[PDB]
């Protein structure tokens, strides 16, 4: 039963916009005195 | 029982702020919106200027034809852009 | 007639289109064109507007809407005024 | 009370006479005709009223209760009367460079704001060491500002008339120079801000990116966009005067900041300065 | 990205040999003797 | 010079009257006070070329 749900975790490949959004990610708020 | 209809409506709204799967027009809408979002942000603009960012996607039939259609359309629009509608002002004057 | 203003009429209108040129009638445009009071006459590329440019006044330039008749062009000739047509590009009739 | 009736009747009479004046002004032919006569001069009215709004917001910000909208409004008024007005009055018309460089200034002011929203909670000023921020006598600051405007207006005036400058392959230089100055300024700001804990409190010495070509790349990038605007209009003398005044003020401020980090960091900034001597221009200054 | 395309003889060209050394000098990655001696006596 | 000034004023007042006349015309057009006159006519039967 696990093979079907792990085979369908990505039935279609990631879109160009998604890959381009992920490829240019940033640090996101490490240098704060609170966190 | 009318609350269930609103529940389904806004649950579908929640699903369409995702990319599970739906009609092609909304997917094109989200793609051009994501392109606008990437382009407007400057800290997302600079990381585009790294050749590896292009290269990973380049090394990964429909796409080439879609990109070459916009080539001839752009060529048409640029060629029409340099000419005055009246070439001979004097001969029509 | 070797005026320094050889061709600086249509282009300058194409730049300062943002100006507000008030309206004037056809018959007064004729009556002041004949008078040798106007410095230039400008034709729009659809021949449905005409931006006058006289020598003195406040403002200099206006807008006169035009009927297509030959006697218009006859008095434009016999007045002895500067005749030119603004040429738009080929996208503006595809943008519309 | 009768006094309420009397004051209400007085207000009604004043409103009646004011509305009579308003109605006889609205239906007035000569008033509308002269209104259209003064409709001829519309673009210069917003350009001058923005100066009044900007000085009002600037006095409020000097007092200290200005929202961020008023600060960006001051920024916008400065950018309009330094990159939209100089060829709107000294040519009468805008086409080509002024819109591009007006938006380029807005684009160039927005890295110290963008970075300090990203790598922070907000723009709120963190408590810090009072001697860290570089401060200069106010007469020197206004002298620098006046010199910068004199250079920019002089580039506008000494530059030729607007639509006669060429195109084609000769307008690629400003493109690449603007790209270079944006890239180098962004690298300088990022390398300066990725180490400091607070707003300006550096921990180590930055010797990466443009810092290994020049000792002050932020100031030289501002210098280079100055030169970019001046070169887009093809005026060398105003570029030279801009260079002179910015060299004087930036060199003064660089000398105080350099002696501050020499005192504060000891041998580290000394060897960094020995590695790269050129302060503003690569192997020129 | 760029070493996948550059020719071998262009790499063995003296220009590419002197380009790398100026890259190291500008970036500051000169590896000296005393560095490696301090490293070897730093280990255990 | 006085004649120049006065005839400048003469042609300028001519333009004053023509633009003011146009403005008063378009101001009176909408209010319906000029309804029925030749500046706001009413439709009728068609007509031929002859
Ligand atoms: C919009 C931003 C404001 C632009 C401000 C530009 C400006 O003030 O320019 C004035 C010139 C005309 O002045 P004059 O010499 O014609 O009297 O007038 C212009 O050239 C305005 C051009 C306005 C462009 C739209």
- C-alpha dist (Å) from residue D191 to A26, B16, D253, D274: 15, 39, 20, 20
Report the distance separating Cα C11 and Cα C71, nearest Å.
27
CA angle D189, D191, D193 (to 5 degrees): 65
Dihedral (CA of D149, D62, D249, D206) sign: negative
Report the distance separating Cα D153 and Cα D107, nearest Å.
21
SS3 for F1-50 is CHHHHHHHHHHHHHHHHHHHHHHHHHHHHHHCCCCCCCCCCCCCCCCCCC
Report the distance separating Cα A33 and Cα A35, nearest Å.
6
DSSP one-letter string for D212-277:
GT-S-HHHHHHHHHHHHHHHHTT-HHHHHHHHHHHHHHHHHHHHHHHHHHHHHHTHHHHHHHHH--
Count how many residues are written for chain D. 285
**CB-based contact F24 D36, cutoff 8 Å:** no
Q: Which residues of A touch B35 (CB under 8 A)?
A: 17, 20
Token pair 């790294």: residue: B50
Contacts (Cβ under 8 Å, ≥6 apart) of B51: E1, E2
Report the distance separating Cα B90 and Cα C84, nearest Å.
8
Report the distance separating Cα C51 and Cα C23, nearest Å.
10
Report the distance separating Cα D105 and Cα D78, nearest Å.
10
Report the distance separating Cα D71 and Cα C22, nearest Å.
39
Tokens of E5: 């395309």
Torsion of CA B13, B17, B18, B24, to 10 degrees: 80
To which H or E segment does residue C64 belong?
strand C63-64
Report the distance separating Cα B47 and Cα E1, nearest Å.
15
Helix D217-232 and helix D173-193: axis angle, to 10°?
A: 160
Contact D202, D195 (CB under 8 A): yes
Contact B16, B22 (CB under 8 A): yes
Resolution for the entry shown, Å: 3.3
Q: How far is F50 from chain D (nearest CA, A)?
A: 42
Report the distance separating Cα D91 and Cα D162, nearest Å.
7
- Burial label, E42 (beta-carbon count in 10 A; 0-12, 13-18, 19+): exposed
Which residue(s) pair with C64 in the sheet?
C24, C50
Report the distance separating Cα D185 and Cα D108, nearest Å.
9
- Contacts for C29-32 with beta carbons within 8 Å, 24 or more apart? C29/C64, C30/C72, C30/C75
Contact D87, D154 (CB under 8 A): no
D127 touches chain C (CB under 8 A): no
Tokens of C54: 């006289």
Contacts (Cβ under 8 Å, ≥6 apart) of D219: D246, D250, D253, D254, D280
Report the distance separating Cα B77 and Cα D51, nearest Å.
41
Q: How far is B44 from chain A (nearest CA, A)?
A: 6
Q: Which of F10, C61, F20, F13 is nearest to D31 (CA)?
A: F20
In the DSSP assignment, the letter for residue D208 is S
To which H or E segment does residue C53 belong?
strand C53-54
**CB-based contact F19 C22, cutoff 8 Å:** yes
Tokens of D77: 């008024």
SS3 for C25-42 is CHHHHHHHHCCCCEEEEE
Report the distance separating Cα E34 and Cα E37, nearest Å.
5
Q: Is D5 helix (H, G, I), strand (E, B) or coil?
A: helix
Interface of A with B (CB under 8 A): 12, 15-21, 23-24, 26
Contact B56, A23 (CB under 8 A): yes
Contact D82, D105 (CB under 8 A): yes
Q: Is D284 helix (H, G, I), strand (E, B) or coil?
A: coil
- C-alpha dist (Å) from residue E28 to B56, D207, D209, E31: 30, 10, 12, 9
Contact D100, D83 (CB under 8 A): no
Dihedral (CA of D210, D214, D215, D217) sign: negative
Contacts (Cβ under 8 Å, ≥6 apart) of D277: D215
Token pair 């009429």: residue: C9
Token pair 């002859």: residue: F50
Helix D173-193 and helix D97-109: axis angle, to 10°?
A: 10
Question: How many helices (H) and strands (E) are present in chain E, helices listed first?
Answer: 3, 0
In the DSSP assignment, the letter for residue D40 is G
Helix D217-232 and helix D138-158: axis angle, to 10°?
A: 30
Give the chain D residue nearest F19 (alpha carbons).
D33
Report the distance separating Cα F9 and Cα F7, nearest Å.
5
Phi, psi of D42 (to 5 degrees): -80, -40
Helix D217-232 and helix D97-109: axis angle, to 10°?
A: 170
CA angle D218, D221, D227 (to 5 degrees): 150
To which H or E segment does residue C16 belong?
none
Ramachandran region, residue D282 (left: φ > 0; alpha: ψ -120 to 50; beta: rest): beta
B50 touches chain D (CB under 8 A): no
SS3 for C73-89 is HHHHHHHCCEEEECCCE
Contact C3, C40 (CB under 8 A): no
**Strand C38-43 to C53-54 pairing:** antiparallel
Q: Which D positions 193-212 lie with beta carbon below 8 A of chain A?
A: 194, 197
Q: How far apart are the first and last CA of chain B?
A: 75
Question: How many helices (H) and strands (E) are present in chain A, helices listed first?
Answer: 2, 0
In the DSSP assignment, the letter for residue B93 is -
Contact D238, D191 (CB under 8 A): no
In the DSSP assignment, the letter for residue D194 is T
Phi, psi of D77 (to 5 degrees): -65, -40
């Amino acid at each position: 039963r696990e093979f079907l749900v792990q085979f369908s975790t990505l039935r279609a490949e990631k879109r160009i916009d998604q890959i381009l959004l992920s490829l240019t990610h940033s640090d996101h708020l490490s240098k704060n005195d609170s966190g | 029982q009318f609350k269930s209809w609103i529940f389904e409506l806004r649950e579908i709204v929640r699903e369409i702020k995702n990319a599970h799967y739906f009609l092609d027009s909304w997917t094109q809408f989200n793609s051009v919106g994501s392109f606008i979002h990437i382009f407007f942000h400057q800290e997302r603009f600079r990381k585009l200027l790294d050749p590896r960012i292009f290269s990973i996607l380049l090394l990964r039939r429909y796409f080439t034809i879609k990109g070459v259609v916009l080539f001839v359309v752009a060529a048409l629009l640029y060629r029409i852009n340099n000419r005055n509608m009246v070439e001979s002002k004097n001969l029509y004057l | 007639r070797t005026s320094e203003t050889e061709g600086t009429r249509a282009l300058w209108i194409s730049k300062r289109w943002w100006r507000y040129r008030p309206k004037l009638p056809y018959t007064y445009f004729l009556q002041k064109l004949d008078s040798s009071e106007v410095a230039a006459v400008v034709f729009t590329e659809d021949l449905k507007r005409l931006y006058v440019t006289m020598k003195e006044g406040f403002p200099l330039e206006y807008i006169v809407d035009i009927p297509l008749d030959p006697y218009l062009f006859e008095t434009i000739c016999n007045a002895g005024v500067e005749v030119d047509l603004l040429q738009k590009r080929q996208i503006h009739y595809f943008m519309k | 009370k009768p006094m309420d009736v009397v004051k209400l009747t007085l207000l009604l009479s004043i409103l009646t006479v004011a509305a009579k004046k308003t109605l006889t002004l609205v239906l007035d032919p000569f008033f509308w005709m002269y209104f259209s006569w003064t409709w001829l001069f519309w673009p210069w009215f917003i350009a001058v009223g923005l100066a009044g709004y900007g000085i009002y917001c600037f006095r409020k910000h000097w007092l200290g209760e200005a929202n961020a909208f008023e600060q960006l409004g001051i920024v916008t008024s400065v950018f309009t009367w330094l990159t939209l007005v100089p060829p709107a009055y000294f040519n009468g018309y805008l086409e080509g460079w002024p819109y591009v460089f007006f938006l380029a200034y807005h684009y160039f002011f927005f890295f110290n704001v963008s970075v300090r929203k990203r790598l922070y909670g907000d723009f709120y000023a963190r408590t810090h060491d009072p001697k860290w921020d570089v401060n200069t006598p106010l007469w020197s600051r206004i002298l620098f500002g006046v010199g910068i405007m004199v250079g920019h207006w002089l580039a506008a005036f000494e530059g030729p008339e607007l639509h006669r400058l060429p195109g084609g392959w000769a307008n690629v230089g400003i493109w690449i120079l603007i790209v270079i100055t944006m890239l180098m300024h962004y690298d300088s700001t990022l390398y300066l801000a990725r180490y400091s804990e607070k707003v300006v409190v550096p921990t180590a010495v930055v010797q990466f990116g443009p810092y290994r070509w020049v000792r002050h790349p932020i100031y030289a990038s501002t210098m280079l966009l100055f030169a970019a605007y001046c070169t887009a209009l093809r005026a060398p003398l105003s570029l030279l005067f801009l260079l002179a005044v910015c060299l004087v003020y930036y060199n003064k401020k660089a000398k105080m900041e350099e002696e501050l980090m020499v005192e504060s960091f000891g041998q580290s900034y000394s060897d960094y300065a020995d590695k790269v001597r050129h302060k503003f221009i690569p192997f020129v200054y | 990205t760029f070493s996948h395309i550059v020719p071998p003889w262009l790499r063995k060209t003296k220009v590419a040999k002197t380009m790398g050394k100026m890259l190291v000098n500008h970036l500051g990655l000169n590896l000296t003797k005393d560095d490696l001696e301090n490293v070897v006596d730093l280990m255990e | 010079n006085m004649e120049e000034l006065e005839r400048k004023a003469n042609v300028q007042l001519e333009r004053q009257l023509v633009m003011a006349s146009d403005w008063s015309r378009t101001l009176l057009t909408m209010r319906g006070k000029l309804k029925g006159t030749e500046w706001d006519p009413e439709t009728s039967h068609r007509i031929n070329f002859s």
